[PDB]
Design an enzyme around this catalytic site. Structure first.
Site, PDB file in Angstrom:
ATOM      1  CB  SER A   1      -0.946  -0.005   1.205  1.00  0.00           C
ATOM      2  OG  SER A   1      -2.120   0.672   0.875  1.00  0.00           O
TER       3      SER A   1
ATOM      4  CD  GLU B   1      -5.250  -3.915  -4.506  1.00  0.00           C
ATOM      5  OE1 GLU B   1      -5.495  -3.427  -3.384  1.00  0.00           O
ATOM      6  OE2 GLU B   1      -4.233  -4.584  -4.774  1.00  0.00           O
TER       7      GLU B   1
ATOM      8  CG  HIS C   1      -5.871  -2.284  -0.175  1.00  0.00           C
ATOM      9  ND1 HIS C   1      -4.890  -2.122  -1.130  1.00  0.00           N
ATOM     10  CD2 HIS C   1      -5.527  -1.479   0.856  1.00  0.00           C
ATOM     11  CE1 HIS C   1      -3.993  -1.257  -0.694  1.00  0.00           C
ATOM     12  NE2 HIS C   1      -4.353  -0.857   0.511  1.00  0.00           N
TER      13      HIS C   1
HETATM   14  O1  LIG Z   1      -4.668   1.467   2.360  1.00  0.00           O
HETATM   15  C1  LIG Z   1      -5.176   1.933   3.384  1.00  0.00           C
HETATM   16  N1  LIG Z   1      -5.301   3.340   3.611  1.00  0.00           N
HETATM   17  C2  LIG Z   1      -5.208   4.436   2.645  1.00  0.00           C
HETATM   18  C3  LIG Z   1      -5.713   5.720   2.996  1.00  0.00           C
HETATM   19  C4  LIG Z   1      -5.635   6.788   2.085  1.00  0.00           C
HETATM   20  C5  LIG Z   1      -5.050   6.597   0.798  1.00  0.00           C
HETATM   21  C6  LIG Z   1      -4.526   5.338   0.424  1.00  0.00           C
HETATM   22  C7  LIG Z   1      -4.602   4.263   1.337  1.00  0.00           C
HETATM   23  O2  LIG Z   1      -5.645   1.000   4.263  1.00  0.00           O
HETATM   24  C8  LIG Z   1      -4.915   0.143   5.094  1.00  0.00           C
HETATM   25  C9  LIG Z   1      -3.667  -0.413   4.532  1.00  0.00           C
HETATM   26  C10 LIG Z   1      -2.681  -0.986   5.560  1.00  0.00           C
HETATM   27  C11 LIG Z   1      -3.582  -1.691   6.618  1.00  0.00           C
HETATM   28  N2  LIG Z   1      -4.829  -2.224   6.071  1.00  0.00           N
HETATM   29  C12 LIG Z   1      -4.381  -2.808   4.842  1.00  0.00           C
HETATM   30  C13 LIG Z   1      -3.891  -1.786   3.797  1.00  0.00           C
HETATM   31  C14 LIG Z   1      -5.784  -1.112   5.562  1.00  0.00           C
HETATM   32  C15 LIG Z   1      -6.879  -0.837   6.599  1.00  0.00           C
HETATM   33  C16 LIG Z   1      -7.836   0.233   6.032  1.00  0.00           C
HETATM   34  C17 LIG Z   1      -8.554   0.031   4.834  1.00  0.00           C
HETATM   35  C18 LIG Z   1      -9.414   1.021   4.316  1.00  0.00           C
HETATM   36  C19 LIG Z   1      -9.534   2.237   5.010  1.00  0.00           C
HETATM   37  N3  LIG Z   1      -8.843   2.453   6.160  1.00  0.00           N
HETATM   38  C20 LIG Z   1      -8.014   1.491   6.650  1.00  0.00           C
END
Ligand SMILES: O=C(Nc1ccccc1)O[C@@H]1C2CCN(CC2)[C@H]1Cc1cccnc1
Ligand SMILES: *[C@@H]1O[C@H](CO[C@@H]2O[C@@H](C)[C@@H](O)[C@@H](O)[C@@H]2O)[C@@H](O[C@@H]2O[C@H](CO)[C@@H](O)[C@H](O)[C@H]2NC(C)=O)[C@H](O)[C@H]1NC(C)=O
Ligand SMILES: *[C@@H]1O[C@H](CO[C@@H]2O[C@@H](C)[C@@H](O)[C@@H](O)[C@@H]2O)[C@@H](O[C@@H]2O[C@H](CO)[C@@H](O)[C@H](O)[C@H]2NC(C)=O)[C@H](O)[C@H]1NC(C)=O
Ligand SMILES: *[C@@H]1O[C@H](CO)[C@@H](O[C@@H]2O[C@H](CO)[C@@H](O)[C@H](O)[C@H]2NC(C)=O)[C@H](O)[C@H]1NC(C)=O
Ligand SMILES: *[C@@H]1O[C@H](CO[C@@H]2O[C@@H](C)[C@@H](O)[C@@H](O)[C@@H]2O)[C@@H](O)[C@H](O)[C@H]1NC(C)=O
Ligand SMILES: *[C@@H]1O[C@H](CO)[C@@H](O)[C@H](O)[C@H]1NC(C)=O
Ligand SMILES: *[C@@H]1O[C@H](CO)[C@@H](O)[C@H](O)[C@H]1NC(C)=O
Ligand SMILES: [Cl-]
Ligand code: NA
Length: 526
Positions: free
Chosen positions: A195, A322, A435
């Site tokens: 990510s 994703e 994702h």
């Molecule tokens: O990629 C992001 N953040 C994200 C926020 C802004 C822009 C791009 C990327 O998310 C995380 C990430 C690491 C931990 N886990 C797995 C992948 C996720 C948990 C999550 C998922 C969706 C929203 N908030 C939290």
């Protein structure tokens, strides 16, 4: 079991892994705590100690806002920090194989979290399996996130931007200077991250200051050319200033703004980070990497385009779904607790959520490209389109464009399409191969028969773990022993990629090709 590092001795611990032993050094300091006058600055070098630093438990995670959207839901809380938040958080971890190796390839993990969240100490970032199974050393570090790590007054060293990236860089340095004492080969160091961690890895490929600190690179669901990855200098200052005003630190002498922002408590700064943008999305990166003129000397897309990056092999890939993870963080009609059948009207409102500052014609053109269905009477059409919209735009198409662009300058690249859905995935089934849910396979959690994984999953993890380890050690992510499908290089003409699943591993060409011409050609014009 004590190891002498350049700053002093560290005592680790023994772990029983698969009737064997990994040696763990958890929470080794790698910089002066960025505290007091040091907040918002580049990490300062660490002063030597003489005692035995007891690196026997994970250290503090860096200050950050926590996902409170699903209290008690393991699907969200598995990613929330699992040690105290504290500005004192610049630590790293080392897992070495026992018996101590001679010259082992080193794997350095960089976590994601939108550059706002994350910590090395999470259950699914445990490097003891890789150490045990593949005889590699695994290193991970905490780096500053959010404004504390990426606030930017360009030029001004009291808040230059990219502090969090220089934190990572300082840990890569620490590996260069010290890993040989742990049995590691500093000449064979693979960065890997998922990510925002994967965008960080790609940014280390462009940063001259990092070119000598690693060999190879692995990018999981992320790259610097993703639309969330780089904050413009305009946004960075409007956001720095709007944090100033939100905290009553609006001043003219931009240094006194920082001095003022320094007497604030982390919480004061944490709770105002959300509102420095007028309209946000689940994918908002309020404070992220910037073209600071130090770590990053030009707009990275230009560096990519014109071949200004470290020449080496990359492993890149993306997961089948994703987008879905972000739909339940704001999109109307979506819930993890039902099948989220949304309508045309709901799909339209969802685009306003994810593309808020985009023209009507721009939102109209996304809808157009994604609602030419084969069967127009399938009730999930709009549900799946919106996930694909977020996924293609934010992750899949930029990773493909990064890989085409990068390989055009002559280096071997390998692309994967992870498309297995974990049997333990706690989110619902309509959200698919989400994702972030290849990470546990990469780290070998299915290698524990006790961990409630299917046998098929143990075998896929075992093949992925060997491919990653072989890419780290030899720059070639083959599994040569078990008559595995060979993994062809991603050339910019044929664009072959390898699908990863529990059934048939297959060689495919030109992923999401129709979709990515839209995002990569048409949509940047709107
Ligand atoms: O990629 C992001 N953040 C994200 C926020 C802004 C822009 C791009 C990327 O998310 C995380 C990430 C690491 C931990 N886990 C797995 C992948 C996720 C948990 C999550 C998922 C969706 C929203 N908030 C939290
Ligand atoms: C640059 O910043 C201004 C100011 O942001 C406002 O104040 C912050 C402290 C915070 O509370 C933000 O949410 C505020 O928006 C932005 O101007 C605002 O824009 C919105 C909608 O765009 C409007 O309704 C407000 O009235 C505006 N306020 C002021 C004082 O002008 C401005 O949009 C930012 N520029 C960008 C994002 O390009
Ligand atoms: C799926 O659920 C969404 C979300 O609604 C919430 O979560 C559910 C599990 C349940 O507990 C609801 O009571 C909660 O409100 C539903 O979205 C709602 O839909 C109605 C009309 O359909 C609308 O007025 C509400 O504003 C919506 N709420 C939110 C938070 O979006 C949705 O209808 C459900 N869909 C299906 C197909 O089951
Ligand atoms: C390839 O398959 C072989 C078995 O045909 C696997 O080798 C075994 O590995 C496990 C642990 O990984 C050990 O318990 C066994 O002793 C090994 N040997 C035998 C003869 O079974 C090997 O792990 C597989 N490798 C992959 C999928 O990469
Ligand atoms: C350790 O090995 C060094 C050479 O590293 C080699 O090249 C890099 C690029 C990796 O791909 C790696 O697999 C190779 O082994 C030697 O120069 C060094 O002296 C060795 N040190 C030891 C054995 O203590
Ligand atoms: C470090 O660990 C040893 C071994 O258990 C212990 O005796 C020592 O007091 C520790 N040092 C601390 C806690 O500062
Ligand atoms: C801003 O304040 C700092 C801190 O005292 C000072 O060093 C600097 O010269 C000032 N710059 C101005 C007034 O332009
Ligand atoms: Cl083509
Ligand atoms: Na410096």
């Amino acid at each position: 079991i004590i190891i002498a590092t350049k700053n002093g001795k560290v005592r680790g611990m023994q772990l029983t892994v698969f009737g064997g032993t990994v040696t763990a050094f958890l929470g080794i300091p790698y910089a002066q705590p960025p505290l007091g006058r040091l907040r918002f600055k580049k990490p300062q070098s660490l002063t030597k100690w003489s005692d035995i630093w007891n690196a026997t438990k994970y250290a503090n995670s860096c200050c950050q806002n926590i996902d409170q959207s699903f209290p008690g839901f393991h699907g969200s809380e598995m990613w929330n920090p699992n040690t105290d938040l504290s500005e004192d958080c610049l630590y790293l971890n080392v897992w070495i194989p026992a018996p101590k190796p001679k010259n082992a390839t080193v794997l350095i993990w960089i976590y994601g979290g939108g550059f706002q969240t994350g910590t090395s100490s999470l259950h699914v970032y445990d490097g003891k399996f890789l150490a045990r199974v593949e005889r590699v050393i695994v290193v991970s570090m905490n780096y500053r996130v959010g404004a504390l790590g990426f606030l930017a007054l360009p030029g001004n060293p009291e808040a230059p931007g990219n502090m969090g990236l220089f934190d990572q860089q300082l840990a890569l340095q620490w590996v260069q200077k010290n890993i040989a004492a742990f049995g590691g080969n500093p000449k064979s160091v693979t960065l890997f991250g998922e990510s925002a961690g994967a965008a960080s890895v790609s940014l280390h490929l462009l940063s001259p200051g990092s070119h000598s600190l690693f060999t190879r690179a692995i990018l999981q669901s992320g790259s610097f050319n993703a639309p969330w990855a780089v904050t413009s200098l305009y946004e960075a200052r409007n956001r720095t200033l709007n944090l100033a005003k939100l905290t009553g630190c609006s001043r003219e002498n931009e240094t006194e703004i920082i001095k003022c922002l320094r007497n604030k408590d982390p919480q004061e700064i944490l709770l105002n980070e959300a509102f420095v943008v007028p309209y946000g999305t689940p994918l908002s990166v309020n404070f992220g990497p910037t073209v600071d003129g130090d770590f990053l000397t030009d707009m990275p897309d230009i560096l990519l385009e014109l071949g200004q990056f470290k020449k080496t092999q990359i492993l890149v890939g993306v997961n089948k779904d994703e987008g879905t993870a972000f739909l339940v963080y704001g999109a109307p009609g979506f819930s993890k607790d039902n099948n989220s059948i949304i309508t045309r009207k709901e799909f339209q409102e969802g685009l306003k959520i994810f593309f808020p500052g985009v023209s009507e014609f721009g939102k109209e053109s996304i809808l157009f490209h994604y609602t030419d269905w084969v069967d127009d009477q399938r009730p999930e059409n709009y549900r799946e389109a919106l996930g694909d919209v977020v996924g293609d735009y934010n992750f899949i198409c930029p990773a493909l464009e990064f890989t085409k662009k990068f390989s055009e300058w002559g280096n071997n690249a390998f692309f994967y399409y992870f498309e297995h859905r974990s049997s333990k995935l706690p989110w619902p089934e309509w959200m698919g191969v989400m994702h972030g849910y290849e990470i546990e396979f990469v780290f070998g959690l299915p290698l524990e028969r006790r961990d409630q994984y299917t046998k098929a999953e143990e075998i896929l993890s075992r093949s992925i773990v060997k491919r990653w380890a072989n890419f780290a050690k030899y720059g070639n992510p083959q599994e040569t022993q078990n008559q595995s499908t060979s993994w062809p290089v991603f050339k910019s003409t044929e664009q072959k990629y390898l699908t990863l699943n529990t059934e048939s591993t297959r060689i495919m060409t030109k992923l999401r090709a129709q979709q990515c011409r839209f995002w990569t050609s048409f949509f940047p014009k709107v």
